[PDB]
Amino acid sequence: FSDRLRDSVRGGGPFDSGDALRQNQGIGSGAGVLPNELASLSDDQVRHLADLTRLGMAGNLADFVMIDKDGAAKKGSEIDYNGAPGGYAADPTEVVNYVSKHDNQTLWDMISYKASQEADLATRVRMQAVSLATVMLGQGIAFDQQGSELLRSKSFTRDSYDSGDWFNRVDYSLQDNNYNVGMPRISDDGSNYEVITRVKEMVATPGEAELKQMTAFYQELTELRKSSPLFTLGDGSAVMKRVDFRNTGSDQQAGLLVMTVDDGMKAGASLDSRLDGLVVAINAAPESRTLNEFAGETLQLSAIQQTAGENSLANGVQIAADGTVTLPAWSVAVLELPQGEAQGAGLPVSSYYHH
Amino acid sequence: QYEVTDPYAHSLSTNSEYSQVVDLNDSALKPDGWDNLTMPHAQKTKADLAKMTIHESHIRDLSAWDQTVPAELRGKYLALTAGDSNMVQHLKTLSASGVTHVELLPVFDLATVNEFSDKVADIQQPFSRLCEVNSAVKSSEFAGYCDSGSTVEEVLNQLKQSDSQDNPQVQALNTLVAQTDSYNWGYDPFHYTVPEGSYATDPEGTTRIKEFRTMIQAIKQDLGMNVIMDVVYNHTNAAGPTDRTSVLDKIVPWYYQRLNETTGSVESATCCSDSAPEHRMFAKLIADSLAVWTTDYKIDGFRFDLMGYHPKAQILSAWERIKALNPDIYFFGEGWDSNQSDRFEIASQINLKGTGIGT
Ligand SMILES: [Ca+2]
Ligand SMILES: [Ca+2]
Numbered sequence: 157f158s159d160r161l162r163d164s165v166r167g168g169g170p171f172d173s174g175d176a177l178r179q180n181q182g183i184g185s186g187a188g189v190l191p192n193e194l195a196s197l198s199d200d201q202v203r204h205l206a207d208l209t210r211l212g213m214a215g216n217l218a219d220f221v222m223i224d225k226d227g228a229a230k231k232g233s234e235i236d237y238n239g240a241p242g243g244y245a246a247d248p249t250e251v252v253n254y255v256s257k258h259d260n261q262t263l264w265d266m267i268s269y270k271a272s273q274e275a276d277l278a279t280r281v282r283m284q285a286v287s288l289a290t291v292m293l294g295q296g297i298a299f300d301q302q303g304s305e306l307l308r309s310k311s312f313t314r315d316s317y318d319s320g321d322w323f324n325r326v327d328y329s330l331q332d333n334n335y336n337v338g339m340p341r342i343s344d345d346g347s348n349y350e351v352i353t354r355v356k357e358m359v360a361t362p363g364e365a366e367l368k369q370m371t372a373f374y375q376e377l378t379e380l381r382k383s384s385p386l387f388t389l390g391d392g393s394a395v396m397k398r399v400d401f402r403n404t405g406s407d408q409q410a411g412l413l414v415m416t417v418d419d420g421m422k423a424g425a426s427l428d429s430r431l432d433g434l435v436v437a438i439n440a441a442p443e444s445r446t447l448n449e450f451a452g453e454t455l456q457l458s459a460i461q462q463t464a465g466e467n468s469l470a471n472g473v474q475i476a477a478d479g480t481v482t483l484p485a486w487s488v489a490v491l492e493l494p495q496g497e498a499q500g501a502g503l504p505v506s507s508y509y510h511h
Numbered sequence: 512q513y514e515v516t517d518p519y520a521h522s523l524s525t526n527s528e529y530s531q532v533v534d535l536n537d538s539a540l541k542p543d544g545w546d547n548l549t550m551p552h553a554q555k556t557k558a559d560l561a562k563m564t565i566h567e568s569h570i571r572d573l574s575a576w577d578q579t580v581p582a583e584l585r586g587k588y589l590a591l592t593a594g595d596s597n598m599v600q601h602l603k604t605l606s607a608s609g610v611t612h613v614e615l616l617p618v619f620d621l622a623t624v625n626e627f628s629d630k631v632a633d634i635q636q637p638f639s640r641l642c643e644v645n646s647a648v649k650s651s652e653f654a655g656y657c658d659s660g661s662t663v664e665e666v667l668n669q670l671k672q673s674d675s676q677d678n679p680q681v682q683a684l685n686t687l688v689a690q691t692d693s694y695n696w697g698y699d700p701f702h703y704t705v706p707e708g709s710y711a712t713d714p715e716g717t718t719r720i721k722e723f724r725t726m727i728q729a730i731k732q733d734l735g736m737n738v739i740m741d742v743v744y745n746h747t748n749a750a751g752p753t754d755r756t757s758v759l760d761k762i763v764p765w766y767y768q769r770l771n772e773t774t775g776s777v778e779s780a781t782c783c784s785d786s787a788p789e790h791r792m793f794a795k796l797i798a799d800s801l802a803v804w805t806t807d808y809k810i811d812g813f814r815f816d817l818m819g820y821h822p823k824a825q826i827l828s829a830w831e832r833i834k835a836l837n838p839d840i841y842f843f844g845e846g847w848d849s850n851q852s853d854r855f856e857i858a859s860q861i862n863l864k865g866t867g868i869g870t
């Protein structure tokens with residue numbers, strides 16, 4: 157299991173107690189982009205979480221070269237994670253990415269602790285989806301807790317092992333996410349009661365509509381993952397020869413995660429007979445963003461996302477004839493490069509370093 | 512790592528997917544009395560040459576619309592055998608009044624026509640066929656006609672009625688037809704030394720060789736005119752390691768094509784993928800190709816497309832070489848400025864004064 161992307165997307169780390177549970181926002185809680193009243197996270201601190209997320213999305217590899225928070229070209233193993241080498245794997249199949257598991261706070265509960273008072277129920281639902289997209293659309297193995305598709309809550313229970321049917325409730329009749337059903341266990345969460353009270357009433361409890369909205373988003377993300385062999389390269393060498401990122405460096409826009417996957421002639425063989433390349437764009441920001449990177453590139457939104465319509469995570473994504481992409485706030489887009497009558501040059505990697 | 516066809520292929524499978532081992536000297540590939548076929552018009556002297564009166568024709572342009580030509584032979588080399596046709600009899604009278612030569616627009620292996628019958632639809636056929644082959648037609652302003660039991664020819668005449676500069680409906684449907692038709696001039700070389708298969712009754716195998724020869728015999732014996740083959744050595748249809756039609760650039764990458772001095776990108780001055788007749792092996796390819804059309808196909812003259820892109824030295828070299836197989840062979844082409852004078856003395860109108868090569 158990789159704790160690198162987990163902690164970057166969720167915010168903070170386990171053992172966090174008291175106001176730290178609110179102060180330590182994540183890319184998905186709006187660290188930097190939409191701070192909460194208790195937050196004090198710096199721009200470099202926020203940029204470093206982007207660095208860890210990207211590395212994770214590219215299967216947390218030790219040898220994967222990327223442009224860091226400062227503009228330096230760094231191997232995955234050279235990106236720090238609390239004193240440890242961030243990247244450690246030889247192949248993405250050696251990494252399991254996740255943002256929720258039985259142990260520790262549910263993704264929803266973490267967002268409830270970390271989201272700004274300004275983030276309404278609608279944006280928090282998308283915040284959950286955005287968080288999940290980093291796992292679902294990344295080269296590493298996708299893992300997730302049962303119930304994340306139904307905004308699962310444990311009403312702030314950290315170690316729900318013996319918190320019975322009450323706290324660990326998953327409503328399959330979709331009436332609620334089991335949020336605010338009581339104060340969690342005093343023994344292990346008493347030290348967080350003051351933080352819980354501060355955040356508990358900040359936003360309304362999800363209902364049939366919100367759970368259905370989240371299930372639709374979840375099904376979208378998984379459908380996308382299975383929509384191309386480019387999302388699941390498996391071999392570390394394939395990842396390095398095909399995967400790269402944009403909106404990198406010192407000058408980077410916070411919350412914008414842009415991943416490119418090559419199927420072009422310079423990568424090797426045509427893996428997807430329909431595509432020449434892929435673009436994953438995650439705008440984990442309250443402001444809508446622009447993509448001029450793919451200047452004159454002929455891109456199209458995924459058929460999966462186009463079918464979804466108003467219920468899509470890409471709902472409102474603009475692709476100008478001139479190759480400019482407008483990404484709405486709290487949105488995820490899979491921009492695909494269609495293959496012509498033969499494998500063309502696609503989205504070749506920088507090839508800035510090897511080994 | 513890829514499997515490529517031979518650039519020196521002399522016979523192919525349908526749509527030039529595989530090269531075929533062949534013996535052009537085989538009686539089986541010859542119409543009766545091919546071996547004793549002679550040039551109906553002399554080309555020995557300047558006075559013999561000056562008599563040259565060329566009629567530049569195209570295989571579809573000749574028989575696509577002629578009803579007096581049996582249906583199965585329309586748009587084919589064999590159409591020239593339809594002795595009792597309006598087209599054949601017309602050429603017969605033109606020949607009798609003084610037209611000496613027939614110039615054939617690309618009859619070598621073109622890339623721009625699918626040789627598989629079932630991946631193609633022509634105007635002669637129902638509109639339904641057009642939609643089956645062409646995905647685009649099913650999602651266009653003409654989608655409604657897929658249901659009608661009328662032909663593409665029919666629908667086209669219907670569109671004429673309201674065709675105007677403000678409503679150019681005839682050409683809009685034609686654009687779509689044109690992607691899945693059998694019609695192209697053919698200035699898109701796939702293989703230089705094999706006849707085109709779509710102008711044959713059966714493009715799988717050697718059939719094309721006997722049929723082409725049969726057309727030559729008909730033109731020279733039955734119509735009494737010499738033959739000029741239009742040639743395109745200035746470009747290849749494609750390059751790079753992926754294009755289906757890249758043959759030369761897959762075998763010896765960066766050799767046969769003319770590349771930009773800075774980027775190494777294949778130049779496209781000619782349109783398409785600029786070849787390099789200035790390089791020794793491509794100059795050899797050109798000469799060896801012309802040898803085959805000269806003796807095995809009994810061609811009397813050659814017209815070089817965008818000849819200005821060739822070095823004058825190459826054209827003269829090929830000419831001396833071909834003259835050893837047929838001393839009365841004529842070479843001419845489009846000797847416009849190609850802008851290649853930085854690289855070599857171009858085969859231009861100006862540069863060819865007194866060489867014997869016509870422009
Ligand atoms: Ca491909
Ligand atoms: Ca052909």
Ligand SMILES: [Ca+2]
Pocket residue numbers: 623624689690691692693694695
């Ligand atoms: Ca055509």
Ligand SMILES: [Ca+2]
Pocket residue numbers: 853
């Ligand atoms: Ca030049």
